[PDB]
Amino acid sequence: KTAKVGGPACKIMGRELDLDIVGNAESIAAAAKEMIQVTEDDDTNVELLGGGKRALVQVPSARFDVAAEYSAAPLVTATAFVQAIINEFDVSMYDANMVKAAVLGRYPQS
Amino acid sequence: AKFEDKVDLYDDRGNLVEEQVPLEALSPLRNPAIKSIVQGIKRTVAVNLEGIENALKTAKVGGPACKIMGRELDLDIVGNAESIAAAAKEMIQVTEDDDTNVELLGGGKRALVQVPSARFDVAAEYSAAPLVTATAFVQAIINEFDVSMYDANMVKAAVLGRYPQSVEYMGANIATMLDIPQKLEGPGYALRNIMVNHVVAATLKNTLQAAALSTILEQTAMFEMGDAVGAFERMHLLGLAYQGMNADNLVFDLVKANGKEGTVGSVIADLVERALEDGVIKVEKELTDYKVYGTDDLAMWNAYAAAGLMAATMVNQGAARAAQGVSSTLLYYNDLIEFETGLPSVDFGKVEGTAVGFSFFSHSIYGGGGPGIFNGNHIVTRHSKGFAIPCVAAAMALDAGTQMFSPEATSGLIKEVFSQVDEFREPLKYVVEAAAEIKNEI
Amino acid sequence: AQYYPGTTKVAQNRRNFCNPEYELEKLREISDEDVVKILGHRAPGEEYPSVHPPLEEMDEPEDAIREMVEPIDGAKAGDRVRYIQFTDSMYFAPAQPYVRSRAYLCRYRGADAGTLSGRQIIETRERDLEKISKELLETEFFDPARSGVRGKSVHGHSLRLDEDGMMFDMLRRQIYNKDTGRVEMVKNQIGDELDEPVDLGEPLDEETLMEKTTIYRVDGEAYRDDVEAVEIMQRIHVLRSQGGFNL
Amino acid sequence: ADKLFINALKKKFEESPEEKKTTFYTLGGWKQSERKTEFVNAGKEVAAKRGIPQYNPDIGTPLGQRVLMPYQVSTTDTYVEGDDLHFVNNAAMQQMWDDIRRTVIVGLNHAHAVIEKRLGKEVTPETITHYLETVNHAMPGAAVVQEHMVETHPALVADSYVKVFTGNDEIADEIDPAFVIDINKQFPEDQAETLKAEVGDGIWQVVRIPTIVSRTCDGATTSRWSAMQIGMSMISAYKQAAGEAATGDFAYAAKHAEVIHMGTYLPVRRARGENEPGGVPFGYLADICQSSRVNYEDPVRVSLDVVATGAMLYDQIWLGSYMSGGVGFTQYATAAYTDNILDDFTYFGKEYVEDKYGLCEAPNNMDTVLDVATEVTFYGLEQYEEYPALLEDQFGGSQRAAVVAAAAGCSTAFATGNAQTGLSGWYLSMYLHKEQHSRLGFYGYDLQDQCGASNVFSIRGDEGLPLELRGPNYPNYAMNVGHQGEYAGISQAPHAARGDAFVFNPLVKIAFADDNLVFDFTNVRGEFAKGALREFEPAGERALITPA
Amino acid sequence: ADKLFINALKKKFEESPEEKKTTFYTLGGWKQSERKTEFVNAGKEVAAKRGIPQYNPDIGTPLGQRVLMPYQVSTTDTYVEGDDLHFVNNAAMQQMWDDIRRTVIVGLNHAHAVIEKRLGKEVTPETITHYLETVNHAMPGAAVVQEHMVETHPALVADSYVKVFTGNDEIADEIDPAFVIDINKQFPEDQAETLKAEVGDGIWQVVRIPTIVSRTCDGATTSRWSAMQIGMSMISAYKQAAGEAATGDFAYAAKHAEVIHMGTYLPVRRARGENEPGGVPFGYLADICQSSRVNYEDPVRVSLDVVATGAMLYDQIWLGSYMSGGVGFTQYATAAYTDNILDDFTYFGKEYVEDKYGLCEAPNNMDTVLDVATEVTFYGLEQYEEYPALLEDQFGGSQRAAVVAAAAGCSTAFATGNAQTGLSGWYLSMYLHKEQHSRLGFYGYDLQDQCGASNVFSIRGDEGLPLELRGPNYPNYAMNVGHQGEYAGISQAPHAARGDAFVFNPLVKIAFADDNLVFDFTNVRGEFAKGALREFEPAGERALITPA
Ligand code: F43
Ligand SMILES: C[C@@H](OP(=O)(O)O)[C@H](NC(=O)CCCCCCS)C(=O)O
Ligand SMILES: O=S(=O)(O)CCS
Ligand SMILES: O=S(=O)(O)CCS
Ligand SMILES: [Cl-]
Ligand SMILES: [Mg+2]
Ligand SMILES: [Mg+2]
Ligand SMILES: [Mg+2]
Ligand SMILES: [Mg+2]
Ligand SMILES: [Mg+2]
Ligand SMILES: [Mg+2]
Ligand SMILES: [Mg+2]
Ligand SMILES: [Mg+2]
Ligand SMILES: [Mg+2]
Ligand SMILES: [Mg+2]
Ligand code: NA
Ligand code: NA
Ligand code: NA
Ligand code: NA
Ligand code: NA
Ligand code: NA
Ligand code: NA
Ligand code: NA
Ligand SMILES: [Zn+2]
């Protein structure tokens, strides 16, 4: 909503997006969980906290069994929430990159 | 039951092995043979006992041209390899009947070591393999010869090099296919930082197996990176199936039709015809004497194109028996197919982009090198998300000796040790069998 | 295959250069020895140096890809990989940098082609390079004024012509003779003197350069006026753009 | 009436610019050049002095078979040979990078909370002033607490200091004005209001460590050196024990919790610490350049001064030396800031968009991209076709591609008011160009451009990022000339058309709006010209401590 | 007769060095010092010039309540105020670091095999000479292939060049001697024999890139820069296509397969690339120092020249600026290279060892550590007790700890011929010292010294390493002053007592045996004195391209 993304004091004027993410948290969390999970009823956990303001996410163990390390957790979680937010509000191709910056920051430049 | 697609799976002689296999039975997330290859690569180490012994005797430890005069230790390590390796295994294993494997090779000059899976189960990443192996051998050597407290640090330097002063194990006499976690270009990249030469070494220059091993590792990394999550998942699975597993015998049949006299451009024509024949693409509009093709299934077009791309590499670099033009093939296969069809090239331009930079950084002063030193973590070749590097592996498999920095030069220890592992050497077999086996669980 | 969209002569020419069934017009006759002299990799009658043993003398791995893919002859012999490189004037040279790489990988087996703005290169096994190079030099791939055979110091693609209509060459490898109206190659492609110059024939006249050129230019046929070709380019842009976002 | 580059073409060549034929080979080789003659003589002297051969014009091939051209620094009337724009021979360019490398921005917000909440002492404008007098003694390398301290020569470190800013005018007015970057003075009213609203009551230090230290050491020295002297001055000015537990809070605040580096550190293959060029994101580079605050009625000029800042830093210094070296990449970069060529193309494009849409009034979509980037690409490529002299001037395809696409991408961003569609126009321009001339750039030039279209709007882990957050470590961009400086330009473009005070960080913008900088960031091209003429005086020299 | 430090103490103070009382507070504060007076005057000018307060003697506490001492540079008759030994004020020190940072070692062995085996061309002494004339034009930044290249000013880059060395005398004889580091000329016979045997028929380049570039950029630029101009010179001299597939082999060889960096890259918390101080292992630092080839009959002098080399670089520039900054750490380092104090303690130790065991004839064990380290530690500490001037000279406990332990560590290694027992001696010295005076160093001084005994002989992953292989990024050693340079000296000590030509890398040893370097590595402390007197002329200045 503020276009403040990418690090401390960073902001991109004119890129603001007014999305009710917390108000639609349950739909967004359910859609993100469907992408994070490998199979229905595996050990994926997505749980909303603080009235939808926070989410606890546990990425299924099957993803780590065929991973070298542990960065699938943030990476799978980030992309699933980016896509879920995009899908929830039908965010255009032109603007979706702001959702990506709001979730995972300045990465891959940083 | 997420995707309706099914593929026919073939062996590396073009024989149908299993028809009608659900696409997701080839998924890194589901397929037990991919899981075993990945867990294998995490846990396998080569030990150069001869190199350790020679570094000790000459006091040449800690990297290129380094020596400490007066530190020389003359230890009959290779002559006592069996006792040293058994003593190391005792340390490495968690229990007596676990999957620890320690095997002498080359009459004791080398050892294949597979650290127990139980260590990885409570580890964040994969560095327990080298670090557990290295300390087990250092301690086994010291105990074997009763090396003094005063001298034992030389054994450590011979085994693991200049580490912890260097970030890397610099001058070490052990090797892994993986490199340290600090060298990742990005999080989730570790399975991409395996040199093409190491893949070609481990598959003993069998082209289709080298392509398979490279694609499995590349596309498995796409899952770890998050690239194969949600919208992109089917595209990545189709890419692994058609480009790396010879699904539907498409790669194999394109090579057969074009191996005698064929060129990149002839492979392209056959691929487009085949995509037309199969209903993957259809004419969308006629311009002047020019058909604009479209598709209702971009991920399937992409997969067909990626199959042709691999076949074009095998035709082009196969005909030269010289790997260097794989950078050219990776570019113009994709450039040509776009103007042939009106459809986006493999990975939506990203293979072409990678190929531009890879061509440059294998024919210029600025960096890079021959095709065999690249890998999916290399800054030059990380851009395509699994669709480029498997072609580079096929090309180096087909090279008959034009490279100075060949797998013989860069990867000799990996060749001796890692080729011993059947699932690394012949991964296409194992992955096909496992997909067959789990076919009805999808 | 259709190769390239567009309704201009430029676009047709681009299609023809790619189409291995189109017979390239031959414009000049060059001896075997002169091709070798121009390349400058070996002297005429010197044995082809080897980089590895003949394939027949080696134990290749069992590999259906190797079985199905016939090696070019120089690969069978173990020849070096050597090159020939050309610079094409933007003043209507017949062939141009992407057109060459595209055409080379349609026409030629076992080819490593590279495209740059001031230089375009093909590397392949030496005896096979020699055969390809005869075609590249004898046919309408090459004009001796608007094209130059150059393994270094390639500058001149974007330069103005001299008074003879020749392309700039820092090392003056190709000399227009005013007495015959013909160009001679006086040096090999790397810039060393040949004992005996090679005749490369007359430059193509202006009308013929226009008919044969594959560059688009406002004083030729402009790319913006090939609206179907601008298509497919804008199409590809859009579909790539959409693709990288979703499918 | 004339295209902007015509005068420069007339200066370089005898022919009129439309003439297709010229004369070569009779120019005397290197002897046509005043600068190459200087070099030949210097080479003779150097080799004789040191006993090892060095520069020698007869090694390899003989330069100057064609005209060795003067170049006009764009927006100036200064014409210099290209050697004078090499960063090695240009003190202005070296100082520009030194002023960026030796700068860090450091909050005082946490620090003052530590003083108040943990030490239980008061912070007022007057204690801040005392602290700032103290830190202006200490920062260059001088002592405030221990006996028998040995110190830096104040004249060698004269360029090191600390200033502050804050968006609260009334507080800014109570801190001694010698130490304050006055936002209302440096910025036009609307930009000042924006910047002050962004900063609010926050109080930020701009710290510049000595050029001589930056040059001896590295960019990652800067936030450390800063934090040492902040820490000393906090002890001295607020009467701490000189080394108590609370001291560590100031350290962690100055080094981590409220530090803003100019550049983030880089991965191992191109391993570098903080405050190296590769870590500076394009949005920051646009904000470091101060053209926005002085040339705010001319969005082209602001965008192209940003291009000049980044082409020089990212191509000549960063890619042409840190990442390669040797002769390097002067003219890869000079193409984007000489002869008024990019200017001609971008003013064309700004005019086109203004007449058709109104700046910032075009739909933000692919229709606008296709429209604007195609129009402007055709315009720029037509110029090379209509003027052979222009084509011979920008003789390398990569140069043309970067110039033409910069104009197309900036113009598309002028239309939409969004950097991301600007970036899509940049890629489209390359694909059209490549098809038009059947050539584009050097062998590896369009690695990023063939990936480009697909990665503009991607949201994937190492693919998706607003252009303002990308920089030289965005994976596709990590290697190649002819892009990074132009991308800084395209990041500036829409914000310059919008009248925005900053592109990506308001603190970075304010931090370079400081008359005590050595390099003049409001007139980057002017400064490059001054350095080419050998009229720029850098900090960091050792004359005072060496023989006369 | 006199201890070696008596002349220095007598010059510092009016009292005999034995006296226990003196006069303070009435010496005039900063006014007793020429150098501080210079600084007060400079600070007023600087502040007025720039409009910002700067150096001010009335900020914080008043320096010079006690004597502000001169220091003798050990082995010289040069006495200077300590400010003149600050690296910011000493161009000799800055040039030492530049000469290392800008140097890389690059084989021609793979390159020559690419030529003969992939290209099928010959390599001979003649083609090598032509190549070296070519790379000596190209390396400083001048062109060999392309038309219209713009180049570095030869005078600005006069210190860049390429030399070779090889163990094969006949081949070395055939290369123009201007390009050759002559091992037989630069080393005494027995050392020449060893080094030649180590190199064998290998041919190695020593590449120095320009100081000006190294200061503009960083150490990780050096091997890139080097590789580009090698790559160009290989193209030009060997008639390759200018950019074929084989060109990539030369790149990979020069940048990776046969490159020897001076320093390896550092992990993220201290993120730096190659050729930064923290990556230089102790054994390379000893080998860079050239005291071994000129002072070979005196193992103490050799070892303490190394200490001086390392103390300045690792404590003053590295830990005192790259890893911290400000006034920094001059006197932590000067304690190890001034006043002949370390010299007296280490000559004592050498004499003890010589008399009792014979150099290198002690058992390599803990018995020897306990004997020698204990004896020398007590000697050193008794000097501070017997000479109140000495104690007030080296006023900081850290300083004394480093100096006494360095003597103890070197003397232990002189007895054993082994660096690792040397190191154990160093740690034991610390523990004895700590108990004798109920103090040791600064707050965090003995992090490594409390880990130290246990980590000397450990074999564990990040613990175990021969001392020659350790350096500033050895985990325990990564942070703190008053150890790195002395460890470099203990690495040198056993090799010096043994008569060894090198400590850790014979290529590194030979590579600095070059009279074309700017800094004289054979007489490091002489050079520090020259730089303190403002008599040293560094490379890299920009006076040619700035105003008069
Ligand atoms: C040897 C290479 C291959 C390689 O890896 N780098 C080279 C050479 C390198 C050298 C040339 C210096 C010298 O002459 O000694 C430097 C200056 C880099 C360095 N080592 O300092 C360079 N190229 Ni190159 N290089 C450039 C360019 C180009 C253009 C030149 C085309 C034209 O027709 O002249 C082409 C690529 C293209 O065709 O697109 C080119 C190629 C080449 N580039 C060909 C040699 C071409 C030929 O033989 O003459 N550069 C340019 O397009 C403009 C800027 C220019 C760079 C110097 C600067 O920016 O001022 C230089 C950048
Ligand atoms: C490829 C890579 O080098 P290596 O492949 O690691 O030897 C990389 N070079 C560069 O990107 C050089 C950048 C500028 C030179 C080309 C400019 S277009 C680097 O050194 O880190
Ligand atoms: O010729 S290359 O494209 O490799 C380099 C351009 S500087
Ligand atoms: O007092 S501390 O030991 O913290 C620092 C000494 S420089
Ligand atoms: Cl899909
Ligand atoms: Mg035996
Ligand atoms: Mg024992
Ligand atoms: Mg066919
Ligand atoms: Mg004939
Ligand atoms: Mg007041
Ligand atoms: Mg007296
Ligand atoms: Mg007494
Ligand atoms: Mg008295
Ligand atoms: Mg030879
Ligand atoms: Mg001579
Ligand atoms: Na679950
Ligand atoms: Na004129
Ligand atoms: Na020359
Ligand atoms: Na690197
Ligand atoms: Na006295
Ligand atoms: Na004071
Ligand atoms: Na850090
Ligand atoms: Na001057
Ligand atoms: Zn520097």
Q: Please report where in the chains the tokens 């050539």 appear, as a residue.
A: D439
Among E238, E314, E332, E387, the active-site one is: E332
Return d(Cα B348, Cα D450) in angstroms, integer.
Answer: 9
Among E95, E205, E480, E492, the active-site one is: E480
Query: How close is the Cα of B79 to the center of ligand 6, in Å?
Result: 4
Residue C158, min C-alpha distance to chain D (Å): 5
Q: Please report where in the chains the tokens 């592996």 appear, as a residue.
A: B393
Q: List domains and CATH numbers for chain C.
A: 1-247 (3.90.320.20)
Return d(Cα E499, Cα E488) in angstroms, integer.
Answer: 17
Question: Any chain B CB within 8 A of the CB of C53?
Answer: yes
Other beta carbons within 10 angstroms of residue E367's beta carbon come to 10
Q: How far is CA B264 from CA C2, C21, C131, in A?
A: 15, 15, 19
Return d(Cα B357, Cα B360) in angstroms, integer.
Answer: 5
Return d(Cα B313, Cα B326) in angstroms, integer.
Answer: 6
Judge: B71–E418 Cβ closer than 8 Å, yes or no: yes
Return d(Cα E82, Cα E71) in angstroms, integer.
Answer: 6
Q: How far is CA D175 from CA D123, D200, D510, E238, in A?
A: 12, 16, 17, 67
Encoding tokens for residue C49? 């140096």
Return d(Cα D295, Cα D212) in angstroms, integer.
Answer: 32
Q: Which atom of ligand 3 is nearest to the CA of B363?
A: 4
Return d(Cα E441, Cα E434) in angstroms, integer.
Answer: 9
Question: Any chain A CB within 8 A of the CB of D331?
Answer: no
Are C225 and C7 within 8 A, CB to CB?
no
Return d(Cα D110, Cα E168) in angstroms, integer.
Answer: 64
Return d(Cα E272, Cα E159) in angstroms, integer.
Answer: 25
Judge: A12–D466 Cβ closer than 8 Å, yes or no: yes
Return d(Cα C146, Cα B238) in angstroms, integer.
Answer: 47
Other beta carbons within 10 angstroms of residue D294's beta carbon come to 18
The count of CB pairs under 8 A between chains A and C is 5
D456: alpha, beta or left? (left if phi > 0; alpha if psi -120 to 50) = alpha
Query: How close is the Cα of A79 to the center of ligand 5, in Å?
Result: 16
Q: How far is CA B160 from CA B157, E274, E459, E465, in A?
A: 5, 20, 10, 9
**Domain segments of chain A as ranges:** 1-110
Q: What is the largest CA-CA distance in chain B?
A: 85
Q: Which atom of ligand 4 is nearest to the CA of E398?
A: 6
D523 burial class (0-12, 13-18, 19+ CB within 10 angstroms)? buried
Q: How far is CA B306 from CA B139, B344, C66, D518, E9, in A?
A: 49, 11, 20, 54, 80
Return d(Cα C117, Cα C122) in angstroms, integer.
Answer: 15
DSSP conformational letter for E146 = -
Among E60, E120, E146, E326, the active-site one is: E146
State the SS3 of chain B: CCCCCEEEEECCCCCEEEEEEEHHHHCCCCCHHHHHHHHHHHHEEEEEHHHHHHHHHHCCCCCCCCCCCCCCCCCCCHHHHHHHHHHHHHHHCCCCCCCCEEEEEHHHCEEEEECCHHHHHCCCCCCHHHHHHHHHHHHHHHHHHCCCCCCHHHHHHHHHCCCCCCCCCCCCCEECCCCCHHHCCCCCCHHHCCCHHHHHHHCCCCHHHHHHHHHHHHHHHHHHCCCCCHHHHHHHHHHHHHHHCCHHHHHHHHHHHHCCCCCHHHHHHHHHHHHHHCCCCEEEEEECCEEEEECCCHHHHHHHHHHHHHHHHHHHHHHHCCHHHHHHHHHHHHHHHHHHHCCCCHHHHHHHHHHHHHHHCCCCCCCCCCHHHCCCCCCCCCCCCCCCHHHHHHHHHHCCCCCCCCHHHHCHHHHHHHCCCHHHHCHHHHHHHHHHHHHHHC
List Cβ neighbours of E495 (8 Å cut-off, separation of 6 or more).
B69, B70, E286, E292, E419, E502, E503
Judge: B163–E502 Cβ closer than 8 Å, yes or no: no
Does residue D332 carry a catalytic annotation?
yes
Does residue E332 carry a catalytic annotation?
yes
Does residue E56 carry a catalytic annotation?
no
Return d(Cα E132, Cα D53) in angstroms, integer.
Answer: 9
Are E198 and E187 within 8 A, CB to CB?
no
Return d(Cα C195, Cα C3) in angstroms, integer.
Answer: 42
Q: State in words which class domain B1-43+191-442 has.
A: mainly alpha
Q: Please report where in the chains the tokens 């973590």 appear, as a residue.
A: B377
User: Apex CA D428: angle with CA D427 and CA D430, to 5°?
Assistant: 65
Residues of chain C found within 8 Å of residue A93, distances taken between Cβ atoms: 241-242, 245-246
List Cβ neighbours of E438 (8 Å cut-off, separation of 6 or more).
none
**Nearest-CB residue to C158 (from D23, D392, D459):** D392
Beta bridge partners of E71: E80
The response to whether residue E252 sits with its C-beta less than 6 Å from ligand 4 reads no
Q: List domains and CATH numbers for chain E.
A: 2-100 (3.90.390.10), 101-275 (3.30.70.470), 276-535 (1.20.840.10)
**Nearest-CB residue to E118 (from C51, C154, C192):** C51
Return d(Cα B190, Cα B202) in angstroms, integer.
Answer: 18
Reported residue count of chain E is: 548
Return d(Cα E504, Cα E288) in angstroms, integer.
Answer: 10
Encoding tokens for residue B176? 């892994």
Interface of B with A (CB under 8 A): 28-30, 34-35, 38-39, 42, 124-126, 178, 181, 186-188, 190-191, 220, 223-227, 229-231
Report resolution in angstroms: 1.9
Q: Please report where in the chains the tokens 């590595």 appear, as a residue.
A: E521
Residue of minimum CA distance from atom 3 in ligand 1 = E243
Query: How close is the Cα of E40 to the center of ligand 21, in Å?
Result: 10
DSSP conformational letter for E148 = T
Are B345 and B369 within 8 A, CB to CB?
no
Q: State in words which class domain A1-110 has.
A: alpha beta
Question: Any chain C CB within 8 A of the CB of B261?
Answer: yes
Interface of A with B (CB under 8 A): 35-36, 38, 62-63, 65-72, 74-76, 78-80, 83, 107-108
The domain defined by B44-190 folds into Alpha-Beta Plaits (3.30.70)
The response to whether residue D330 sits with its C-beta less than 6 Å from ligand 1 reads yes
Q: Where are the alpha helices (DSSP H) in E153-294?
A: 169-174, 183-186, 189-199, 211-216, 221-238, 245-252, 282-288, 291-294
Q: Do E and A count as touching (3 or more CB pairs closer than 8 A)?
A: no
**Nearest-CB residue to C5 (from B206, B321, B339):** B339
Q: Is D183 helix (H, G, I), strand (E, B) or coil?
A: helix
A81: Cα within 13 Å, side-chain hemisphere: 25
Q: Please, what's the b/e burial string for D12-34 (b: 16 or more CB within 10 A of its CB; e: otherwise)? A: bbebebeeeebebeeeebbeebe
Chain E residues 104-143 with CB within 8 Å of chain B: 110, 113-114, 117-118
The response to whether residue D88 sits with its C-beta less than 6 Å from ligand 1 reads no
Q: How far is CA C95 from CA C92, C208, D388, D438, E500, in A?
A: 8, 13, 20, 9, 65
Return d(Cα D164, Cα D294) in angstroms, integer.
Answer: 21
Subunits next to D (3 or more Cβ pairs <8 Å) are A, B, C, E
